[PDB]
């Protein structure tokens, strides 16, 4: 037995309690787990978005039924990120402007995988017609039935809780953290130490030996997980790991946020996250029953905090001198190495991007998954540490690049912020993808059906942003292949087979818009709200 | 404004030419003219060729050709693995395995399929923990694949009622498959078969091929040229001047001598596997078919003269050299700098080649034609289409080159100059990195799909052709072990217990299928209708 005997987790919230609950299950009670969490007040009433795998990879793994946790954190349903005013100039508005072709300036980024004909994804048949002037229809409407469901504000489940389509979650992050704290402590023997850390003790080879607390207790441990946030109190402050600032890829570094109560009865509830474009950034809208979380992500180089606060407030018609705000300074980038010696960073302590495509919870889950996969013993085999690190850096940079493309290919040039994005360089990896996409080839072609993709985290992790996602953003923003996929010009039978798939999308969207409940109605039932 | 390719000309027949022609016959939906230029071919000995499981799904099903139909026309038999005999022990070649110092025969299998997992960890890792901690005496192949038991009994991968029992692939006479596909393409896809010799490759001011001149006087116009001319690469290397990258710094064998050996099936049964029988200056393949097996001694002509190698090959099988028909081949091992250049796409040996240690030949052809259809161009030859095709071929090839190198690099044999010379070669960075991952006890190329998807969708398998299970078969088979168990297993007593159920499953499937399956021989006699 040269095994890890105690794991000490610094920090609560989602990172700390997801780590704690996950390792509780994965390590089968053979290790003592400690969470050191200073007592704390949540800033807002705010919300957070997730991706489809969360129930299966995380909550199902812990034996936690979906509705149980959803009832304890006022969770709502998400079928996409919906992008608003990303192609057109001017002051932020919650309502879409009009493109030349007469379409609203909106595009959706839904979940699921596109169907193929003759091994060619439906996207490619749509781009063919579009480039050959045989359709005016937009990509999201043509290729995803879920677009029609979201436009109608219908739910992803019928009233009888039968599944209609793919989806993920909006929730109050404070409540999920509290739910998981309760689960960890009462079902998994986690020691919750409610105290502030006052010192990190390290031996001579630079391994952490214990955390000192203000009350005087010394929490010994063998492995330490830094879930302390942007301060990186173990990984950066104690281990002295450099952070790599990546503002040369993404300009937004700040947010001003609040919870907006909302007339659900009057407006319905939107089953999607919104990205509402602003002059020096964007604003998120994350609906839950009774209120929506919202924040204006911005670059402090192009808007002062006061300018942001005023434009944020104007967008929602809020009284700026009479609203509660949470002002956040983002650290954008990742550590040079996520895991150093016996210190593993998870969450904001590890790495961070603006929540433009719901990265936060997923980054946490992926690290925890990878830490269990590469779980060490006390020798801390350097190969295990390196392979963990490679996964995390590939994960992060891939998503960083993907986000950068949202800005780089926006056709907006109306403010210095929007023009400045285009003076940045795209990383080599995403420049290559764009070149592939421009030639009409697929990018990151899905090779599995949806059951396997969302059934096995390793399949999804290997191909997180699929061809369908690259089409959602590039074609939503107006970036098109130079010409159709050339193979299509030889495949008249395949083009016909694709027309059946297009008709399938129309029909499913039609029938489900008829049969589905409103998201409002589904939530009133799920949360028993009078 | 119409820049479509209208004519495809394929130089060369054989498997490469006729698979390319039949496949594009389907893929281009009769919108292109397809021309195959092939010299009148003299019969060759069916020295036998092995395959991998995807061939029926990806290639024959795709064309609407039933498995039994082509097999009955190609003297095909069944393959459940490659089996390595005497790769760990010294001495002259023998078909019979020598005895290791632990009393086992010197054999290890490389079967198909994907290993199951418990708690997301492959069964291999549970076997390795037990092996390293003195808790099992069983070899990796016997512990983790039921197919090992089935092969040891020479049972078939199907029941007589033709229900599938396990994974498998095919042994066939390569000439008969080319003849079969030629007939198909000529009679059902209107391919123009020009039976004639090429005398000149015509090129324009851009370096693009415009036509192939033939001895009879045809000038075969084309828009796209596929080079299936073999090792001489008459289009890709000679006309297009693309250099070939010799890779003898990773694999030493460069030669083969081969023959077909009539076989007493009744007495001996038929082995449902390819054998790789280690020799002093290389190895010898055994590829069973009905009534005979194809065999070939692969060797380096630096360590064995042709005559020396022929004599050793004859002695292995008890053949009389002056009553035996031999086929002699000098390989070109490695790949072109670029597989596709301008309007010339190389396929088969004209593109790249390794010795058939893990049955790569047909697989490389199929993979290239799949990728050609996917990247099919128009007359503008978008440089990005060309480049992405080349990237897939080079990655496919170097990955396999490296896997093959590991067979030799990790052989403990030191008894001849050949076996020692392999271990003075360097491992490429990619495979070194995998070995380091493996030695830490971590998975290598973890399977992320079930077999249905993996074998149902070529692109799934192409993204992960050599999975964790394959690396274990070769590394553990040769005796390279992790430095220590996967360390996560020290914390997972419940997962270890599930894996015990998985080891039980393997034993149960092996016990019950060996009792219930028919011999390979008997299933072959039923399939082929033998008297
Ligand atoms: N792998 C993600 C891709 C995805 C699609 N739409 C998204 C919106 C937000 C974030 C991720 C996504 C998934 O299928 O779930
Ligand atoms: N992807 C191949 C890998 C493989 C396993 N065993 C083999 C033996 C020979 C050649 C390839 C293989 C398959 O599963 O079919």
Author numbering:
A (entry chain B): 2 to 531
B (entry chain A): 1 to 531
Which statements did the authors publish about this structure?
Here, we investigated the reaction mechanisms and structures of tryptophan 6-halogenase (Thal) from Streptomyces albogriseolus using stopped-flow, rapid-quench flow, quantum/mechanics molecular mechanics calculations, crystallography, and detection of intermediate (hypohalous acid [HOX]) liberation. FDHs belong to the class of two-component flavin-dependent monooxygenases which require a reductase component to generate reduced FAD (FADH−) for a halogenase (monooxygenase) component to catalyze halogenation. Several X-ray structures of FDHs have been solved which showed that all FDHs have two separated binding sites.
Structures of Thal and various FDHs including PrnA and PyrH were overlaid and analyzed. Superposition of PyrH, Thal, and PrnA structures showed that the three residues (Lys79, Glu358, and Ser359 in Thal) are found at the same position in all of these enzymes. Moreover, the halogenation sites of the substrate are all placed next to the side-chain of Lys79. We noticed that the space between the tryptophan substrate and Lys79 was confined by the surrounding residues in the pocket and were not large enough to accommodate the larger sphere of the iodide species. We modeled HOI into the active site and found that the van der Waals sphere of the tryptophan does not allow this putative HOI to fit (data not shown). The tight space between the halogenation site of tryptophan and the residues lining the binding pockets would not allow HOI to be accommodated. These data clearly explain the results in the HOX formation section which show that although HOI can be formed at the flavin site, iodination of tryptophan cannot occur because of the limited space in the tryptophan binding site. We believe that future efforts to widen the substrate binding site may allow some tryptophan halogenases such as Thal to catalyze the iodination reaction.
